Symmetry: D2
Subunit: 329 residues, 4 copies
């Protein structure tokens, strides 16, 4: 059973090779992006493994199907790049990773908090060059601060437990509260009260019609002046455009993003040789109190191993006719 | 009426000491310049001088301050290596200090250094800022499940241990005098050399003494787990920096986070970027991709600075009432 | 006995003015702080105040200086936008300046900006410093053979033209009053719009006047050769910065080097890195990969600074002898 | 006629494709380095095109020859990486580019001078982050300064003419002086007097047993205190180790390198993910008054076009039996 990987990185080959010790599939790693003019590379390959920056619109799917590809395996949770209606029409099933490792993602959120708080990215750049001066690097103790967790699913809960260990006072909002958050010392309250009370707000709720642009100009103006916002959830949870004016005024003190609404078109590529087209992202990137990582929150060895194991298992399952993590239109 | 001249003043000194002064009403003067032989004259007529660790308090400077009518040297620091204490005692010029820094500020800084090294956040930032959204080389490791060795389980080491326990780390500890709080966190005490061999991350928090001087030397680095992370927020002389180089070059030491460096009082707290760095060892450390150095920044939070100011102004008030506190 | 207080002082001011003072013996005082309403009091009892372009010389500040006994404002700059001149004349407080900067310093800076953009030297440096010795994206172009358009052929434009002729560039020029020296270099005069369409590199050196204000606006940018390089070391208001953005985004403008920016006196000459930059247009320009901005640094050589100091101290001596020079 | 390129960069494909409009060769671009375990890719290819970081030691050559490769074309001037004795033994001819574009290289030297003088690399990094302060950025006028050109071959002469246009006073050293340098206003003098008199020294002499380590600790101590040194010639012209102490003491004011003695093992690769092994280079890279480019001096579109034209012409010539730019043991 042969699998062609498009948009391959060294960390993909390393994780999938190790995970393949219990499958023995024939793995082919192509660096190029999948798109109309590279689809031909998948000719004769039964399975193609794609990431979110690969093009799986109707024209590409038609070409893969005509070329004899029988399964599209996404080594991602997200699938915005896939025309699912077209894949169904073509009889080409799509599988994916249902969720990323909660420790990897929650740890990354905490890392964004600490780097922003202690200005560690700014310090590094100073000391690397022999600037040992400390002006502007003063932070705040996390101990005693109010940390508001929006969405208390697995990642939010994991994040909450870590922040509880720093001695933070935990606040939470979820449509369906759970007792585990309570056992950590967490207090549930209304979203609006969470936003007004929290020193640090971290988004971990699913994206739905109800949470789309949850943090918009109104929600930003509800927050405590100078507060920190972290979004490792999904880009569309926030209206990035509204973050700018809040950062300019000082209303928002800090921002840590691991996701961005336009990301599948932007992230996972070195675009440094060319002007950045997106005015909003370009402006965010400039601020001294903003750190953006390029959907890096699941980028640990363990979390990548989970993605590889899940994806290879999904493929074995399709092979046997077991509906496992299929995405349907 | 107390008048206090601060040398080597930063905006964060002025802010914190002004706020602490709410319950004292001292007359505070903030001079940016360093204290040294030729700036001591600025302290002319000031009965208290407030100094940081990079200020020069050798005999010639003390003797000039005393002649100029200075009667107390207040250090807004725990450290005092720059003070000739014998010469101060000889002159009857008492020297007061801050006994300890905020344990939450310092332990949280150590955890930040961990996370930034693990997730390569400093490297990521510099990519993304320039539109490089590629992720090669940035892969880290989950902290959950890893073994974290705490060397020195005083107040800061204990605070650090609690935090790391909340990540779901397995805690190892070494201290000549173990305590039960570490135990209650799930921590296991063991021999120093066994801690070093087993730990994925090692963090130094023990006091510097003749026994702990160069505790991490080339032999101890070789005893560590290949690829391990070392964090030193304790004291520069706990580590033999020169040995760290070869360990980093070979990959034996996977990561290094330093907030302190041996003789840092000569290097840190100044922008030296306009000139060659004379120290070959520090220059080499700075340019590895898996080393982050902060310039004794671990107590640099608003709350930790407020504690330093409150303590220092209370030290000054106590000296004024004829019952000195925190003399060295 | 002349006493002079300098506001907004840099180490390079102190060095150059101390050396120039060899033939004057004035008493020089260097204050780092900016001049403004609440620091004017520092000039109390000083008969001359020496200011740079970022110092505040609006009426309230002038009126305070005059009351405090200041009798001359000496600007260590050619520009004076920060001075309320009417209010100074009303107060009988004369204002002197430096007429022009060193043409070699400024033209050489413009050529440096060219070369750094062409060869991506700033980008290269940041790679190599971190051990990235890969060359993708750094390919430049030979200057030899290229068309270089000089807009304004005064002293700086002429000096710039000679340098670029030595690279084997083909020189184009626009000036309302052409001169024969440009010709002797091999330069061709032509219409402004024709210069812009033909030139691979365009450099601004003309005076700012009602006619040249926003000389490079969106229409002129569209007339330029696709992919061309623009250099502005002249004056910020020669260009409509806001138009440069869309031109850079589309690739119509291939490169941009700025040493000046409209209203720079509010932005430049200070480390503002600790705070958000409020100016959306400048923030956008800063983050393109093919834009380099220097902060009005084009006269920042030792020799050009010596000329500024020599001129300023001679302006002060001339005012002292009752025969003022370089009054505005 | 089929040509396999190892260590291929986008700028190689772009230049060689354009240059191929008068040859019609079949061009294959492989990104991977040539070495023992990638030589197999050249099986059946008559011509292999290599750069200086490719491994052309005996084991690799034997494998190429056994696989039917009949010519090694180096898209470089240098050939240290080639075991020529082994290539001769194997009957595998080697061709190269005799010299790089003199304008490209001399221009790059001038760019290194100006960036160092005006600290433009340091300025960029400040202003990018909103630091508009000018401390430490003061330079010097080039006008009137003494510029010493060591080696007045084509590149040295080209460099000299450019620096003459800035109004510099030109000093020169060459075993075989020429009148063109004189017509520019240049004065020939002894090497030692050049070194003592010059504000800026630029190396453009060939590397030979006599010029190896020409700038060594002795020559550095002959220079004017605070002077600038530029080496775009060859790495081995200088003893890099001796530069360090001179930079530390302030004896050497500035250094611009486009070449380095260990370079074929270091340059042309992104090594930023790993510690740098070379202590000397690592130390040079740290100094605020050192700029190193990674043998970038011929990296212009025109100069790359010349390399491509020359290399394709060399290949056509070999084909016809015309000895053109052959390298012999």
């Amino acid at each position: 059973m042969r699998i062609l990987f498009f948009s391959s990185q060294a960390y993909d080959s390393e994780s999938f090779q190790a995970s393949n010790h219990r499958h023995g599939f024939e793995l082919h790693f192509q660096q190029a992006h999948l798109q109309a003019d590279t689809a031909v590379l998948a000719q004769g390959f039964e399975v193609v493994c794609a990431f979110v920056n690969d093009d799986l619109s109707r024209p590409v799917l038609e070409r893969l199907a005509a070329g004899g590809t029988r399964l599209v395996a996404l080594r991602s949770a997200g699938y915005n790049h896939v025309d699912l209606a077209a894949a169904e029409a073509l009889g080409l099933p799509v599988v994916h990773v249902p969720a990323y490792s909660p420790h990897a993602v929650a740890e990354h959120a905490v890392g964004l908090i600490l780097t922003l708080n202690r200005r560690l990215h700014r310090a590094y750049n100073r000391t690397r060059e022999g600037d040992f001066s400390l002006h502007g690097l003063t932070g705040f103790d996390l101990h005693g601060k109010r940390v508001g967790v929006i969405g208390t699913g697995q990642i939010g809960e994991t994040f909450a437990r870590i922040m509880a260990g720093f001695g933070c006072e935990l606040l939470a909002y979820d449509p369906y509260p759970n007792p585990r958050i309570q056992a950590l010392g967490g207090r549930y309250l209304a979203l609006d009260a969470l936003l007004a009370e929290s020193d640090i707000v971290s988004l971990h709720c699913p994206l739905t019609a109800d949470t789309r642009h949850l943090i918009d100009a109104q929600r930003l103006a509800t927050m405590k002046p100078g507060a920190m916002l972290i979004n490792t959830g999904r880009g569309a949870l926030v209206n990035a455009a509204a973050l700018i004016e809040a950062l300019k005024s000082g209303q928002l003190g800090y921002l840590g993003l691991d996701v961005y609404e336009e990301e599948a078109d932007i992230f996972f590529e070195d675009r440094s040789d060319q002007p950045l087209q997106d005015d909003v992202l370009a402006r965010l990137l400039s601020f001294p109190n903003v750190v953006v990582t390029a959907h890096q929150a699941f980028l640990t060895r363990e979390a990548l191993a989970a993605i590889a194991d899940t994806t290879l298992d999904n493929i074995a399952a399709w092979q046997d006719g077991t509906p496992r993590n299929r995405v349907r239109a």
